[PDB]
Design a binder for this molecule. Structure first.
Ligand SMILES: Nc1ncnc2c1ncn2[C@@H]1O[C@H](COP(=O)(O)OP(=O)(O)OP(=O)(O)O)[C@@H](O)[C@H]1O
Ligand SMILES: Nc1ncnc2c1ncn2[C@@H]1O[C@H](COP(=O)(O)OP(=O)(O)OP(=O)(O)O)[C@@H](O)[C@H]1O
Ligand SMILES: [Mg+2]
Ligand SMILES: [Mg+2]
Lengths: 372, 285, 401, 56
DNA sequence: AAAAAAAAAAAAAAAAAAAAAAAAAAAAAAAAAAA
DNA sequence: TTTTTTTTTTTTTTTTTTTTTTTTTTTTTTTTTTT
């Protein structure tokens, strides 16, 4: 209806047509495809980058290119959609309309190898999230990456993953032959100005540019480009700002204080208080940080008996420490008996002092060394 | 070769000669077929790579018989793969049983039904990386004992007959041949079984706050010539380089993944000497 | 034949009926006021408007109404300790939205719901999502294929679908393909799928989910804080209504002694029901404070002193001697041989004779059955390790006092 | 480096008519192979006779 | 040249999840019963 | 000759067992001090 819901709709965090931040990468991928078409030679490629950097959007924009649609056969396979690692031959046979005798994976592999031996168009096999094919033996991934070396085969394949060195770590044997090792292409994370241009393209797509002045965009991009650099978190904070401001103001452009509050937002019971204070006291006074549940419960009971508050038994104390584990202050290493579970504090002590906010009780518990 | 025990207690023209050597070993092939006819097996124990000689034997002589070439220098073959290969591809009998000696029992009972169907078995590097246990050599000795199956093999490791006892050596009816070529091990050492620049290349891929965390680690290691987790967390929270503890833990786990920080018990050392860390810190300023 | 009945069950054509009572249930007019309070204080009786969760209701309602009206799809993650009104508030939001959709104030939508702990595998989420669309029970491979053909292909007029996923931590495994599939389908423009994910831990996306799954999960999150003593009293006095059956200080005691431990609402609504059951058998019509005190002593149990006091004489000598061996050696884990030496010392002091080490092993197994001590299998006699599960001061509180 | 060596497979089958007397007629019909076979069959039957007579 | 002890690295349990093998149940073709 | 019934095999699906990973703890070897 109004500009706020239009902005919240148009940010959308979904598949697009224009990619302003990826211009050299798309030209490089087009040059790779055109140079391997014009020589009619096969070539592997492994593109990588941080999650949210523009890989799947680029290679979905290029699998709708009409000239590459006419010159070669495009195949897209997402690799979390397979029931097992060896089912990628079945999925590729289903995507290429091959006729198999069936009911063994080796016959699907033979059908793909016969389909690569003869040809009429070049094959483009894009395997997205290729880290899901990695196993112990890696017969599947080494079988797939050897298809450019197959005689007469014309498949040029692209593997997309998040790991910068997956072809070096999990494909060590491909370095032994220069015919086989894939050309690498890193997708670097977005800077400040690239995220600014992505916002200014997505807002000019529906002419809703007046909601964001440039200063708040250059603050939000300055934080998100420094934290992770992906555009999904940038568009998520940019959508959350507008959906908070619509709740707040119901045409007012979003202020710097609103995006600052949302950015610092993104980037207790009594017995849990008494448990956290005794854990801080036991870690401060003792250099052995291997605290068991029974050894913590014994100090907790004396601290409670000093303040004349009725203490829980071991059975309620275990559930209390389990509820403090959910907040992220602790990590409980599990053992064979519940008395022997190991509590590990995962905050520094000043965060606990600021989170409990009961310094009159905290200073009283930390000064009582004698109950340990 | 008669070794002395006192050493243990006190502690071009070449290509033409190699071609003449290879022709001389190429002359042995009818005698090898005559030897394989009488139930013996061929074993080669020369210095260099004998891959090309066995490939030339399979090409020039055994161009019409059933042949199972087994690359034992492959770092990822299993004896189950070779047994399934025999059972499914030669005999069309499906996948072999999961216990390998029962699979060799079924291979013997099936090959006893079909005489005059010889299976030649060419195992490059019989002492290969996954055939060096007692079980795979027991399987291969039980396979070579079959009169239909004829075996050729190569050995390169010097400690190879330590895993053959007298029963395996009686099943392996070997005829030993000194096929010493001087060819280098190109294929056999190519596999997986046999840094400042990488640090810079993975450092260019990190974001700004990741670079700042790593510069804090570098500055601490250069000042003290392994830093604790609490000092790193305090220095990260001071410069606002992290939001909480768990993001720093995930970032340091990512640092362990790309081989930049080594964790010890939290001690976080960089496995790089101090002068290169000083030149690297001058590179970032 | 039952096989045709099961083929009808997989097709979803026969309703899974349950047996009906032969006798008609009791009428509401026969119930006492204590009985009406006991059936209103049940935890299965949810109110139509939940007290003290108005802000979280507004947040989830604005989120889901915006994602329905924009026809875009996205994701959310709400979290909090159990008993804090997460699933009740989410289903209240979705019931309000369905009431708006039936009155044509909102576009109509589909509501699928699963639970991570009602599944035997994480892969059965594909079976249970597809079962709520068609009614058919299929394998998870065919259900995954049909859900991908539903969500990835554009087909007007696709209706908006809202998928609530309780217990998200059970759907995680090592491979994380089910949670990646459920959070990846909103990113496609052909799928108007809005995913709401409920779990307990606040830091689940960073602890055990991967980087791309945490990227797809977003940052639009909500946390349900535990109930304070004011809110947890307001809930119970809302459940009681205008009745005068509970005293005002009794509900305050329940809220003050439950909110200090967990903040659970089920704990307070069960302790008040137990207090009502205590007041029923005392032949009174009001639930005064000492009924609540007896119920608080019963529900928040501490019955290790009662076990040590009712142990036999040789069991109590054994329990004194394990603590004596802990005091002597310093370490907490004791072998059986030093315990038996201290046993014979304490029995010689006390004037009794002790059983031989075989019957002492029987005593150790009997105490380890109650988990008063932690002990091994008795195949390694005289060298098995004996932890003391109860504290050493409870033994001296039970055997002296 | 060759097409025969693969990076994925370890075993390679060259089945030629396999179902479920190795040399040719040029050497078997030669007299030296016939006399060798006859002498070996005599000596092997004699050693088998001696071993059975020792074990009986 | 040889002994020891504080810490680091190889290994040893173990425990938790997954790959694969077995077992069973459902579906496609086969062979007999029968109209 | 043509429709229906029952068998056998094959295929798919589920369950159990073995293997692999992954975390924690122990044991062996190393580096550095002492004789
Ligand atoms: N350069 C860009 N310009 C505009 N929008 C973009 C750009 N890059 C990405 N996006 C949008 O942000 C989202 C990022 O998803 P994308 O397909 O890039 O994931 P990805 O990089 O493959 O991450 P992962 O590997 O974790 O799946 C997409 O929905 C896309 O529409
Ligand atoms: N604010 C409230 N007002 C009234 N009743 C409540 C309130 N919060 C919870 N309850 C009652 O307590 C019970 C809580 O169950 P609920 O489904 O809310 O658990 P949850 O908060 O989703 O946590 P989990 O499912 O992890 O245990 C419900 O049956 C409800 O009747
Ligand atoms: Mg992607
Ligand atoms: Mg719930």
């Amino acid at each position: 209806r109004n500009k706020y819901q239009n902005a919240r709709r148009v940010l959308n965090s979904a598949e697009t047509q224009n990619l302003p931040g990826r211009e050299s990468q798309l030209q490089e991928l087009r040059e790779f495809f055109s140079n391997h078409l014009e020589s009619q030679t096969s070539g592997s490629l492994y593109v990588s980058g941080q999650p949210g950097t523009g890989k799947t959007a680029c290679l979905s924009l290029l699998l709708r290119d009409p000239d590459f649609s006419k010159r070669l056969q495009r195949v897209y396979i997402n690799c979390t959609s397979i029931a097992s690692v060896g089912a990628v031959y079945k999925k590729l046979c289903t995507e290429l309309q091959l006729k198999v005798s069936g009911r063994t994976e080796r016959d699907h592999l033979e059908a793909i190898q016969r389909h690569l031996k003869t040809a009429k168009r070049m094959l483009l096999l894009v395997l997205d999230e290729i880290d899901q094919l990695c196993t112990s033996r890696q017969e599947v991934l080494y079988t797939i990456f050897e298809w450019p070396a197959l005689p007469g085969s014309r498949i040029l394949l692209v593997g997309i993953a998040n790991s910068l060195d997956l072809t070096d770590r999990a494909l060590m044997r491909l370095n032994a032959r220069c015919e086989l090792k894939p050309r690498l292409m890193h997708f670097p994370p977005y800077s400040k100005q690239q995220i600014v241009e992505i916002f200014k393209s997505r807002l000019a797509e529906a002419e809703v540019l007046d909601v964001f002045p440039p200063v708040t965009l250059q603050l939000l991009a300055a934080k998100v480009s420094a934290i992770s650099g992906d555009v999904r978190r940038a568009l998520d904070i940019g959508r959350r700002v507008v959906e908070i401001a619509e709740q707040q103001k119901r045409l007012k452009p979003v202020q710097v204080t609103q995006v600052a509050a949302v950015l610092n937002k993104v980037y207790f019971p009594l017995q849990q208080k008494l448990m956290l204070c005794t854990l801080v006291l036991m870690l401060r006074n003792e250099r052995n940080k291997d605290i068991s549940m029974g050894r913590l419960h014994e100090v907790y009971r004396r601290v409670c008996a000093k303040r004349n508050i009725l203490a829980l038994d071991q059975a309620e104390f275990t559930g209390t420490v389990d509820l403090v584990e959910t907040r992220g202050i602790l990590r409980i290493m599990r053992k064979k008996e519940p008395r022997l579970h190991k509590v590990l504090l995962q905050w520094d002590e000043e965060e606990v002092h600021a989170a409990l906010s009961d310094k009159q009780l905290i200073a009283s518990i930390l000064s009582d060394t004698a109950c340990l | 070769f008669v070794p002395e025990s006192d050493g243990y207690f006190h502690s071009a023209e070449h290509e033409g000669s190699i071609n003449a050597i290879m022709e001389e070993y190429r002359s042995y092939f009818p005698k090898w077929m005559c030897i394989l006819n009488e139930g013996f097996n061929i074993l080669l124990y020369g210095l260099g790579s004998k891959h090309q000689l066995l490939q030339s034997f399979h090409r020039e002589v055994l161009h019409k018989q059933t042949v199972l070439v087994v690359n034992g220098f492959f770092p990822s073959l299993t004896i189950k793969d070779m047994l399934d290969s025999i059972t499914s591809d030669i005999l069309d009998a499906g996948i072999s049983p999961a216990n390998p000696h029962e699979a060799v029992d079924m291979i013997e009972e099936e090959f006893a039904l079909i005489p005059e169907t010889h299976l030649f078995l060419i195992v490059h590097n019989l002492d290969g990386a996954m055939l060096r246990n007692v079980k795979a050599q027991a399987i291969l000795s039980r396979l070579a004992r079959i009169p239909n199956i004829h075996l050729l093999a190569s050995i390169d490791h010097i400690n190879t007959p330590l895993l053959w006892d007298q029963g395996k050596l009686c099943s392996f009816n070997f005829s030993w041949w000194d096929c010493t070529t001087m060819l280098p091990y190109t294929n056999e050492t190519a596999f997986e079984n046999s840094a400042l620049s990488s640090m810079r290349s993975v450092f260019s891929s990190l974001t700004t706050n990741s670079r700042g965390i790593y510069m804090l680690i570098v500055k601490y290691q250069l000042k003290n010539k392994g830093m604790p987790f609490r000092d790193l967390y305090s220095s990260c929270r001071e410069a606002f380089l992290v939001s909480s503890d768990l993001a720093l833990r995930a970032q340091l786990t990512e640092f362990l993944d790309h081989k930049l920080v080594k964790s010890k018990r939290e001690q976080l050392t960089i496995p790089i000497d101090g002068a290169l860390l000083q030149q690297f810190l001058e590179e970032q300023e | 034949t039952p096989s045709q009945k099961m083929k009808k069950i997989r097709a979803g054509e026969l309703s899974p009926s349950m047996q009906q009572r032969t006798d008609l249930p009791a009428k509401d007019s026969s119930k006492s006021e204590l009985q009406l309070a006991r059936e209103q204080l049940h935890v299965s009786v949810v109110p139509k408007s939940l007290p003290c969760r108005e802000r979280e209701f507004e947040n989830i309602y604005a989120f889901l109404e915006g994602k329905i009206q924009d026809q875009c799809g996205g994701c959310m993650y709400v979290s909090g300790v159990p008993g804090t009104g997460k699933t009740a508030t989410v289903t209240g939001v979705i019931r309000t939205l369905q009431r708006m959709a039936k009155q044509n104030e909102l576009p109509a939508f589909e509501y699928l719901e699963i639970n991570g702990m009602r599944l035997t595998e994480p892969r059965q989420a594909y079976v249970q999502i597809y079962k709520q669309l068609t009614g058919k029970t299929v394998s998870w491979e065919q259900a995954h294929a049909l859900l991908e053909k539903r969500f990835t292909t554009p087909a007007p007029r696709r209706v908006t679908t809202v998928l609530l996923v309780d217990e998200l931590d059970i759907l995680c495994n090592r491979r994380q393909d089910v949670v990646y599939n459920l959070l990846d389908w909103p990113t496609k423009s052909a799928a108007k799928l809005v995913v709401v994910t409920i779990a307990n831990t606040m830091d689940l996306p960073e602890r055990l989910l991967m980087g791309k799954v945490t990227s797809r999960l977003g940052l639009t999150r909500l946390t349900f804080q535990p109930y304070s003593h004011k809110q947890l009293q307001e809930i119970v006095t809302a459940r009681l209504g205008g009745s005068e059956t509970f005293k005002g200080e009794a509900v305050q005691l329940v809220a003050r002694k439950v909110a200090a431990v967990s903040g659970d609402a089920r704990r307070a609504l069960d302790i008040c029901r137990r207090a009502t059951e205590i007041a029923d058998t005392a032949a009174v019509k009001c639930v005064t404070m000492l009924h609540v005190q007896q119920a608080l002593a019963e529900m928040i149990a501490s019955a290790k002193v009662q076990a040590i006091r009712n142990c036999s004489r040789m069991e109590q000598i054994f329990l004194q001697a394990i603590a004596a061996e802990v005091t002597r050696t310093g370490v907490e884990e004791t072998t059986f041989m030093g315990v038996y030496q201290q046993v014979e010392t304490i029995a010689a002091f006390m004037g009794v004779t002790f059983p031989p080490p075989g019957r002492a092993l029987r005593l150790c197994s009997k105490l380890g059955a109650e988990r008063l001590i932690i002990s091994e299998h008795s195949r390694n006699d005289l060298f098995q390790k004996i932890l003391l599960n109860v504290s050493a001061d409870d033994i001296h509180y039970a055997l002296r006092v | 480096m060759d097409p025969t060596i693969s990076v994925s497979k370890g075993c390679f089958v060259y089945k030629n008519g396999a179902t479920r007397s190795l040399l040719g007629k040029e050497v078997v019909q030669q007299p030296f192979y016939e006399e060798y076979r006859k002498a070996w069959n005599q000596i092997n039957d004699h050693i088998a006779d001696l071993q059975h007579r020792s074990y009986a």
